[PDB]
Design a binder for these strands. Structure first.
Ligand SMILES: [Mg+2]
Ligand SMILES: [Mg+2]
Ligand SMILES: [Mg+2]
Ligand SMILES: [Mg+2]
Ligand SMILES: [Mg+2]
Ligand SMILES: [Mg+2]
Ligand SMILES: [Mg+2]
Ligand SMILES: [Mg+2]
Ligand SMILES: [Mg+2]
Ligand SMILES: [Mg+2]
Ligand SMILES: [Mg+2]
Ligand SMILES: [Mg+2]
Ligand SMILES: [Mg+2]
Ligand SMILES: [Mg+2]
Ligand SMILES: [Mg+2]
Ligand SMILES: [Mg+2]
Ligand SMILES: [Mg+2]
Ligand SMILES: [Mg+2]
Ligand SMILES: [Mg+2]
Ligand SMILES: [Mg+2]
Lengths: 153, 66, 117, 70
RNA sequence: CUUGAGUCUCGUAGAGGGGGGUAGAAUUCCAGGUGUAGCGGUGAAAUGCGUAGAGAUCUGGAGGAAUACCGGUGGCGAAGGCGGCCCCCUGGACGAAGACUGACGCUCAGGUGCGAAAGCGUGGGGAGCAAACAGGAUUAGAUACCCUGGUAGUCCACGCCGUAAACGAUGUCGACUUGGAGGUUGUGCCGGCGUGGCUUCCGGAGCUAACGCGUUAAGUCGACCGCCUGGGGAGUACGGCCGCAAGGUUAAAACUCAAAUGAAUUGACGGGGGCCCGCACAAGCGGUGGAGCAUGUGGUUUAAUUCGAUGCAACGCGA
């Protein structure tokens, strides 16, 4: 807004492992406010991945976030009617927001039977740089690098 | 500031004393604005004339980078 | 092939482009590069960053001569003046002198007419 | 302007002395004024406007100092 | 008769004028060296130039035009105008204290001279720039604005032209009427005190429709000249004069209108500016537009498809 009087909102910690990261992630995965179904799909997926990995849920999911977390994105900007993609920095919280969002979407458009399975093997291949989401980290990174010569106004 | 040629009452600025003209030319070679030095108008005109004369006689460079 | 150990690098910084020509003391060129020749056209070719990349690429392009020191001729208005110098300095060249070589008519010839953009 | 990167000189401050010499020498000034032709009447107009606005600014801030803002 | 007007002597400042010479920076072109895929240009592009070696960088050469810095609401000139440096010929201005003439003055129809830029004639010159022109874009079109080129011209000598928002839109000469801050150039007395010439800004009285002007008057007077008499037609036609021409000058009528005009005021508008707000942008999340259906609307049909709402602010509206 024109004001910057936005305080921060409180968000619940997760029951299974006390992770607000999982609460944010489930709030992204959620549709129509069916929060119980979202948390259940997600705990299912993270235990499927905690077995197909063995690391942990918290940690397999952090390993999927880091390998997908991007560090620089572009920002549209109009100069002479021409529209400039200017690579700006990101605060850590926008990094993980983007990571979780891209991951949920690249899992939504997958082709397994259920959705918890899509998210499980998505976060797995995310951790191994074979998923659409690390691909979008790649696209955003090379998008910032190409127009990096505009790293100024 | 303090215009000098009136202080000592010089009649004519005499292109020959380059060391004098040395102070009213930039080290790139350019005459320095009379506003910046505080020289008086008549004397700044004598200054410009003598500097251009000593340039023609090649005792001062026209520029820093001949 | 040969070695000089001492160079003079000419920077042609225009508003549209930036050219970095490396010669020897007597003006014989060793190598060169340009912002447009480095993967940028139009907007980016006229940026300090493209100039910088062109300066480092021209550094690489004179690797085979073992030059260490460089005088610096900067020519023209463009923003590619300082970025190219820092590129040549960070590249591993020991800068020794820096001279601005922009032509200044002491009148001179009539410039083109103003653009009515 | 010529710049001597002196003994023991950090390159960045000699860069800045270069910047100062070019800025007070009038180099970008001259290139941007000389890029295009100027009608004599046009530049007489512009110099006169510069000087008149400068003297008007002088006397404006001269009448200002003798007033209280609040 | 000497104060108006003018002459003589010392000095001072200035891009005043005419003629010749000379210098540095820079552009373009030529000869060659190095060197290698670009350059150049634009809002973005293309035309154009470059592997037949461009651009870049260096050395040498030719040529033309203008004179960065000084530089300044600084100066000089009747005005138009005048700017590197040197020399020759030349006009004027102002200052200081005198000597001289003795109203010799002011203005000026007709006339005569000078008179930016463009233009014209003859003969040179031609770097850069650039009407015309050509191509490349832009656009609905684009005979433009932008880009790449480019000829007259711009330069010189002589002659012609005689017009400009040739403006201070303010005729010349003379006299008088509070101030303040500066610039520039003389000069008297000792940084201080006087007196002159030119000149920038603010402002009093006064004047003015107001805006403003205001000792450099648009204030208070006198002399003389030019000019105006509603807007359009029209500074046009015809005729005279002038011109090589382009055209200049002098200069109507019929006819038509009730206005056209100036200054200032309140709004509004601006692809003027400054500062702020709003699910207005950005960030997001979910919808509509596609399908089946409900309903309203329009329109067609009908005897009737009752009448009304019908940009936002009508269309699940009166209902
Ligand atoms: Mg141009
Ligand atoms: Mg007459
Ligand atoms: Mg002419
Ligand atoms: Mg001719
Ligand atoms: Mg053109
Ligand atoms: Mg007239
Ligand atoms: Mg005029
Ligand atoms: Mg005028
Ligand atoms: Mg008039
Ligand atoms: Mg007369
Ligand atoms: Mg006044
Ligand atoms: Mg006529
Ligand atoms: Mg006419
Ligand atoms: Mg709201
Ligand atoms: Mg949005
Ligand atoms: Mg539908
Ligand atoms: Mg009715
Ligand atoms: Mg109805
Ligand atoms: Mg109706
Ligand atoms: Mg409704």
């Amino acid at each position: 807004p024109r004001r910057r009087v936005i305080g921060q909102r409180k968000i619940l910690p997760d029951p299974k492992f006390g992770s607000e990261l999982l609460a944010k992630f489930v709030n992204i995965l959620m549709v129509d406010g069916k929060k119980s179904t979202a948390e259940s799909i997600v705990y299912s997926a993270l235990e499927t991945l905690a077995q197909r990995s063995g690391k942990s849920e918290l940690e397999a999911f952090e390993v999927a976030l880091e390998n997908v977390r991007p560090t620089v994105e572009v920002k549209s900007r109009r100069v002479g009617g021409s529209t400039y993609q200017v690579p700006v920095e990101v605060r850590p919280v926008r990094r993980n927001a983007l990571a979780m969002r891209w991951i949920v979407e690249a899992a939504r458009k997958r082709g397994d039977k259920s959705m918890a399975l899509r998210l499980a093997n998505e976060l797995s291949d995310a951790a191994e740089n074979k998923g659409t989401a690390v691909k979008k980290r790649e696209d955003v990174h090379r998008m910032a690098e190409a127009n990096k010569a505009f790293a100024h106004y | 500031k303090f215009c000098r040629f009136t202080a000592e009452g010089v009649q004519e600025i005499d292109y020959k004393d380059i060391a004098t003209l040395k102070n009213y030319i930039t080290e790139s070679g350019k005459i320095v604005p009379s506003r910046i030095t505080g020289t008086r108008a008549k004397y700044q005109r004598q200054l410009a004339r003598a500097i251009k004369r000593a340039r023609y006689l090649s005792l001062l460079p026209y520029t820093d980078r001949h | 092939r040969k070695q000089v150990s001492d160079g003079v690098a000419h920077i042609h910084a225009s508003f549209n482009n930036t050219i970095v020509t490396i010669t020897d003391r007597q003006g014989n060129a060793l190598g060169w590069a340009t912002a447009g020749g480095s993967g940028f056209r139009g907007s980016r070719k006229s940026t300090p960053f493209a100039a910088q990349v062109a300066a480092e690429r021209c550094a690489d392009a004179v690797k085979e001569y073992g030059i260490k020191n460089l005088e610096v001729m900067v020519k023209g208005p463009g923003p590619g003046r300082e970025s190219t110098i820092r590129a040549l300095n960070a590249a591993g060249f020991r800068i020794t002198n820096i001279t601005d070589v922009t032509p200044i008519p002491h009148x001179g010839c009539r410039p083109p007419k103003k653009r009515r953009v | 302007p010529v710049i001597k990167v002196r003994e023991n000189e950090p390159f960045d401050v000699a860069l800045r002395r270069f910047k100062r010499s070019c800025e007070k020498a009038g180099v970008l000034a001259e290139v941007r004024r000389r890029e295009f032709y100027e009608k004599p009447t046009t530049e007489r107009k512009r110099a006169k406007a510069s000087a008149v606005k400068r003297h008007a600014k002088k006397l404006a801030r001269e009448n200002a100092r003798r007033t209280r803002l609040y």
